[PDB]
Design an enzyme around this catalytic site. Structure first.
Site, PDB file in Angstrom:
ATOM      1  N   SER A 179      -7.231  -1.973   6.370  1.00  0.00           N
ATOM      2  CA  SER A 179      -7.004  -1.213   5.145  1.00  0.00           C
ATOM      3  C   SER A 179      -8.194  -1.251   4.199  1.00  0.00           C
ATOM      4  O   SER A 179      -9.059  -0.371   4.252  1.00  0.00           O
ATOM      5  CB  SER A 179      -5.723  -1.641   4.423  1.00  0.00           C
ATOM      6  OG  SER A 179      -5.436  -0.757   3.346  1.00  0.00           O
ATOM      7  N   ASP A 186      -7.565   4.659  -0.018  1.00  0.00           N
ATOM      8  CA  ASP A 186      -8.086   3.493   0.685  1.00  0.00           C
ATOM      9  C   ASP A 186      -8.502   3.889   2.100  1.00  0.00           C
ATOM     10  O   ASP A 186      -8.407   5.042   2.501  1.00  0.00           O
ATOM     11  CB  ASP A 186      -7.136   2.285   0.690  1.00  0.00           C
ATOM     12  CG  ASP A 186      -5.847   2.512   1.450  1.00  0.00           C
ATOM     13  OD1 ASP A 186      -5.070   1.538   1.584  1.00  0.00           O
ATOM     14  OD2 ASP A 186      -5.500   3.647   1.797  1.00  0.00           O
ATOM     15  N   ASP A 245      -7.480   3.360   5.217  1.00  0.00           N
ATOM     16  CA  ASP A 245      -6.490   3.888   6.148  1.00  0.00           C
ATOM     17  C   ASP A 245      -5.574   4.902   5.478  1.00  0.00           C
ATOM     18  O   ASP A 245      -4.577   5.325   6.077  1.00  0.00           O
ATOM     19  CB  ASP A 245      -5.697   2.761   6.818  1.00  0.00           C
ATOM     20  CG  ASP A 245      -4.907   1.898   5.836  1.00  0.00           C
ATOM     21  OD1 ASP A 245      -5.102   1.941   4.603  1.00  0.00           O
ATOM     22  OD2 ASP A 245      -4.059   1.132   6.325  1.00  0.00           O
ATOM     23  N   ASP A 261      -3.184   5.198   3.409  1.00  0.00           N
ATOM     24  CA  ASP A 261      -1.780   5.119   3.019  1.00  0.00           C
ATOM     25  C   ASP A 261      -1.589   4.898   1.530  1.00  0.00           C
ATOM     26  O   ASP A 261      -0.449   4.873   1.057  1.00  0.00           O
ATOM     27  CB  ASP A 261      -0.998   4.081   3.835  1.00  0.00           C
ATOM     28  CG  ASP A 261      -1.598   2.691   3.781  1.00  0.00           C
ATOM     29  OD1 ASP A 261      -2.624   2.456   3.091  1.00  0.00           O
ATOM     30  OD2 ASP A 261      -1.006   1.818   4.457  1.00  0.00           O
TER      31      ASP A 261
HETATM   32 MG   LIG Z   1      -4.023   0.924   3.167  1.00  0.00          MG
END
Ligand SMILES: [Mg+2]
Ligand SMILES: O=P([O-])(O)O[C@H]1O[C@H](COP(=O)(O)O)[C@@H](O)[C@H](O)[C@H]1O
Length: 448
Positions: A97, A237, A239, A241
């Site tokens: 992440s 961020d 990734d 999400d």
């Molecule tokens: Mg994330």
């Protein structure tokens, strides 16, 4: 001891001492033993070591007779979406992440993208991996490459009426993570004019690790919004999400206010729905949900609690103040894409700027932001706070730590489930002075 990479909600550690290809393969074997029958979706982020970790996971899964569906380089939410959409037994996203360069990790889900967490299978996997000295078996199942994103893109676009969208100018900042791929695939279907910042995926992170909460990273989006006269800016961020919003003045919008805003946007499409929220900051969300005809549902903080509550309530939306937004139609999972599409549609339909959509809410329910404390004795520190305020007779709620409602102000104070920290959030009824004096008073008690 125990493997430190196995955390409360996911796996995360430094490569190669805390996480490596051998551990990843053993995780795949152990995961195969925990899931119901069916194939397993695998995806990974832009980090340099991520593909090799996914390949090792796949080797362990297939040695255990699990067919693997490789969705390739993707965002975490795509693992969630494809696990549910393809009716898979489960899924793993290989990602660190927002963390540094030597770190990686995994997020694991079972059927319908339901979380696998410390007490719901993740520590069982840890203990299996820890004791596994067996020789790696050879594959007894196949891997298929499924890099078609069409169903995912259609699902994202289904949240908005594309005929009502205006050609807003939007700054988008992937931070050299993966979000830019999806923005570019959505762009032919949207009227927006994009200003792309730090757009190319680059696991060396030349512009800093993808963490939009760091002020230096925040300022790159703010500057692009201001210099281009954009309607708003969006950063993600690594990734993707999580997404983060900047109004037309370049101001970063505190995540608390997005829960109520997104709830109102969703309730226009799903009237009377339930909306799940966390206990840290609450008053604004409760009011905006009720004003939009929804029913707010208090839930302990943390994605697994929120998703479970949303399921048991048939809640259409759930949101945390910390940039996590969950959608029933999206397998009850979080997306960093759905929120900005909904906000772009709200700005387009209403004629109001993002700034004006939130300004009165921020004045009505000012908040401290989450303030973290590393103290010598958290329990003694909490007791010092409660003893100091006892004579005021607050209304107390122990849903998650301690929530104390004094009437014109309230706080939540809780131990983190992920780190050994005390976390404080304070809000007031339209009173910035009370917010500061109470925040500082509590801060002094905690540090004393
Ligand atoms: Mg994330
Ligand atoms: O920050 P992340 O991505 O690890 O997020 C995880 O931890 C957060 C903080 O939890 P706590 O305040 O108990 O430490 C949770 O709110 C979040 O739902 C969970 O996915």
């Amino acid at each position: 001891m125990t493997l430190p990479a196995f955390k409360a909600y996911d796996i995360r550690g430094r490569v190669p001492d805390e996480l490596n290809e051998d551990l990843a393969r053993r995780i795949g074997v152990a995961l195969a033993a925990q899931l119901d029958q069916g194939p397993v979706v695998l995806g990974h982020d832009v980090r340099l070591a991520s593909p090799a970790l996914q390949e090792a996971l796949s080797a362990g899964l297939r040695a255990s007779g699990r067919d693997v569906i490789d969705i390739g380089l993707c965002g975490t939410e795509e693992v969630y979406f494809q696990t549910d959409y393809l009716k898979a037994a489960g899924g793993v996203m290989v990602t660190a992440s927002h963390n540094p360069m030597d770190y990686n990790g995994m997020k694991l889900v079972r059927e319908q993208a339901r979380p696998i967490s410390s007490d719901t299978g993740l520590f069982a996997i840890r203990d299996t991996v820890a004791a596994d000295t067996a020789a790696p078996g050879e594959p007894t199942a196949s891997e298929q490459s499924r890099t078609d994103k069409t169903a995912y893109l259609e699902h994202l676009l289904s949240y908005v009426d594309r005929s009502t969208l205006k050609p807003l100018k939007l700054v988008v900042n992937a931070g050299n993570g993966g979000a830019g791929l999806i923005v570019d695939l959505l762009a032919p279907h949207l009227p927006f004019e994009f200003v792309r910042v730090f757009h190319e995926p680059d696991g060396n992170f030349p512009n800093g690790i993808p963490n939009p909460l760091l002020p230096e990273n925040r300022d790159a989006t703010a500057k692009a919004v201001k210099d281009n006269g954009a309607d708003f800016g969006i950063a993600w961020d690594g990734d993707f999400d999580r997404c983060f919003f900047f109004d037309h003045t370049g101001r970063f919008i505190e995540g608390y206010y997005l829960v109520g805003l997104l709830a109102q946007a969703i309730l226009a499409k799903q009237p009377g729905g339930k909306v799940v929220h966390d206990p840290r900051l609450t008053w604004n969300t409760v009011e905006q949900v009720e004003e939009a005809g929804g029913i707010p549902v208090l839930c302990k903080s943390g994605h697994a609690f929120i998703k479970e509550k949303m399921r048991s309530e048939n809640a259409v939306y759930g949101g945390e103040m910390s940039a996590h937004h969950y959608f029933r139609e999206f397998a009850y999972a979080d997306s960093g894409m759905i929120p900005w599409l909904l906000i772009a549609e709200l700005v387009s339909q209403s004629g109001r700027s993002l700034a004006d959509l939130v300004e009165a809410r921020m004045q009505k329910f000012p908040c401290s932001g989450e303030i973290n404390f590393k103290v010598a004795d958290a329990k003694a520190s909490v007791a010092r706070v409660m003893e100091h305020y006892a004579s005021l007779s607050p209304e107390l709620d122990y849903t998650d730590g301690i929530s104390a409602d004094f009437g014109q102000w309230r706080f939540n104070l809780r131990s983190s489930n992920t780190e050994p920290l005390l976390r404080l959030n304070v809000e007031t009824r339209g009173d910035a002075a009370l917010l500061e004096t109470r925040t500082q008073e509590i801060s002094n008690l905690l540090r004393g």
